[PDB]
Symmetry: D2
Subunit: 143 residues, 4 copies
Amino acid sequence: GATSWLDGSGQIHLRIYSLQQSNGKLLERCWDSNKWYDGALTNQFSAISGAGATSWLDSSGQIHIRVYAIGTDGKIIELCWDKDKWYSGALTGQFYGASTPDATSWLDKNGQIHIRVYAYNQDNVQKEYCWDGSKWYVGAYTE
Amino acid sequence: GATSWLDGSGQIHLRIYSLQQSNGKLLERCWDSNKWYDGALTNQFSAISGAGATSWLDSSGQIHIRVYAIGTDGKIIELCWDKDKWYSGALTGQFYGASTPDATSWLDKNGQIHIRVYAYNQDNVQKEYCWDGSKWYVGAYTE
Amino acid sequence: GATSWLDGSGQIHLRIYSLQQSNGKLLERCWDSNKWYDGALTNQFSAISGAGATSWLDSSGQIHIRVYAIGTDGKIIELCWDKDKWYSGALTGQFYGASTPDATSWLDKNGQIHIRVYAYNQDNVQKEYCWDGSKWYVGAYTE
Amino acid sequence: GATSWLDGSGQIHLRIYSLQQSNGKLLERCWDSNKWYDGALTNQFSAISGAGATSWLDSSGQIHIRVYAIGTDGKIIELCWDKDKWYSGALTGQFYGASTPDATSWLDKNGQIHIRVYAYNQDNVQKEYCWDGSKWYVGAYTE
Ligand SMILES: CO[C@@H]1O[C@@H](C)[C@@H](O)[C@@H](O)[C@@H]1O
Ligand SMILES: CO[C@@H]1O[C@@H](C)[C@@H](O)[C@@H](O)[C@@H]1O
Ligand SMILES: CO[C@@H]1O[C@@H](C)[C@@H](O)[C@@H](O)[C@@H]1O
Ligand SMILES: CO[C@@H]1O[C@@H](C)[C@@H](O)[C@@H](O)[C@@H]1O
Ligand SMILES: CO[C@@H]1O[C@@H](C)[C@@H](O)[C@@H](O)[C@@H]1O
Ligand SMILES: CO[C@@H]1O[C@@H](C)[C@@H](O)[C@@H](O)[C@@H]1O
Ligand SMILES: CO[C@@H]1O[C@@H](C)[C@@H](O)[C@@H](O)[C@@H]1O
Ligand SMILES: CO[C@@H]1O[C@@H](C)[C@@H](O)[C@@H](O)[C@@H]1O
Ligand SMILES: CO[C@@H]1O[C@@H](C)[C@@H](O)[C@@H](O)[C@@H]1O
Ligand SMILES: CO[C@@H]1O[C@@H](C)[C@@H](O)[C@@H](O)[C@@H]1O
Ligand SMILES: CO[C@@H]1O[C@@H](C)[C@@H](O)[C@@H](O)[C@@H]1O
Ligand SMILES: CO[C@@H]1O[C@@H](C)[C@@H](O)[C@@H](O)[C@@H]1O
């Protein structure tokens, strides 16, 4: 997964997520100014796929990140950053996934984030999972 | 791959890219208001991986989309939309890829797009390919 | 998948199974003496993985072949050859598979074939499926 | 990968090779009589794919095993057992691999092993690599 955002000074920030071949844990690599370095997510969570990532800036300029992967039980895991720590989101453990999830997100005029996550399930069907601010639900998407 | 943008009315547009198990060609599924439909990219390009996608809006409100996959020669293919047609971009055929590419992009203050594409290569090295408006180059990223 | 056997004259026979990128159908490539040719299985069956294969010779010198793949519903499919046609075996549709299955087989003193098939399931557990001549059952194998 | 052989008492021996999600090393699971156990190959070798396996019995009743995987440099690795140790075979490092290798083998009338290994290469071509007792060579196999 790759996600990026511009701060108020026009500096690009990159966050690159991958599954480490040597320990089965997600890696986060960060660029904030002039070099690559390790992110806090590194080595916290096991997965069995790569990760899809999306991010957004709130009205205060705080970055929010969401990372989606397949966990060690075959179900989608959601990892969240809002301020100062990674935590497992509400999506975690709800749905079986068979592919590296894709994700996109957008902010509406009220500052409510909307997220869409896409992954194959156990029946080889491409599914869309939707967040509009209350509960995850299965979307209308079909292949 | 999933990408999305908001138009001037606050309507979300979704574009979801996937590799068809039946014919080895990329599918584009589109949402503009109230239903999913097959996009113009569908069946124009063969690949052997999934697709990473990024997009941006120019100052006129025109969407630009870039889609990255592994082609049938084992090399990264770049598919481009700027207005009314899909075409193969400058990145195509330069580098071997061994994983579904990730991509991100941002617009600088001068309206110049910057793109970063990430994929494993034939040597099992995670590589970053960078566009800043002239030529693709290998970036500083490492795991 | 690859399987092979020696006939009574000491001639090698090779059978190589793969999933075609262009049509999502299994291909069988055959070697019996001096050239590769397309086997009868070719283009008959859709799958979403590669295929594992095993084979055995009965006391009359008749080859029997079993090929295992993930079907388009996410479940293991078994394709069988005993004499003159491919058919779907008893294993088909019983279990979810999340990996290209592996298979091995042996003949006991009474000429009864025993088959063992290994694949991850939807819960990311490596499973063994066993045939000893009556019904498929889940074996004692654990990772 | 799965391989099996019958000893002189008619007892089945199973050897199941897999890539461990926890450490990126090959696991060998063994059945000789009444239980599964970890074999000596376990945790010796890193890989980035699953493993294909083949085995044969020599005239003394000694098993020989060959295991094929993609190593951490993107090239096929060959792991060999003839009596009492695993070692890297002559195929290791020669060819790029982009898929879990398949392998089969047969003994000719003189007791010379023949091995055939199949894997995609970096150019998305299915390749056959052949051993007849001197050097590995690219075979006539095509799709
Ligand atoms: C300040 O912390 C750095 O940036 C945050 C936005 C997160 O990506 C975090 O894991 C990383 O270590
Ligand atoms: C407030 O809830 C947290 O953030 C939302 C935007 C979602 O990512 C949800 O799954 C998560 O638990
Ligand atoms: C309102 O419908 C929901 O949101 C739309 C933007 C799409 O993601 C659609 O598939 C989904 O069911
Ligand atoms: C109007 O055309 C639709 O939208 C464009 C932005 C592209 O996604 C195109 O392939 C699609 O058919
Ligand atoms: C103008 O060149 C086109 O657009 C750029 C933004 C890049 O995607 C490039 O590879 C492509 O050929
Ligand atoms: C200027 O350096 C280039 O751009 C940065 C934003 C990073 O993508 C870096 O790896 C790359 O080499
Ligand atoms: C004679 O038929 C050839 O050999 C048989 C053993 C099968 O492999 C069949 O699919 C193939 O066409
Ligand atoms: C006789 O039944 C057929 O052959 C056996 C050896 C098994 O492969 C079984 O699943 C298949 O239906
Ligand atoms: C008797 O046990 C059955 O056969 C053995 C040969 C093993 O395959 C074992 O896991 C299985 O349960
Ligand atoms: C006796 O040793 C056991 O059997 C051999 C045939 C090999 O599979 C070895 O790794 C394993 O530990
Ligand atoms: C004697 O050579 C060893 O055994 C042969 C049968 C091959 O597996 C070869 O690559 C390996 O080095
Ligand atoms: C004699 O030809 C060699 O051996 C045969 C058994 C086949 O493996 C063939 O593709 C290879 O070139």
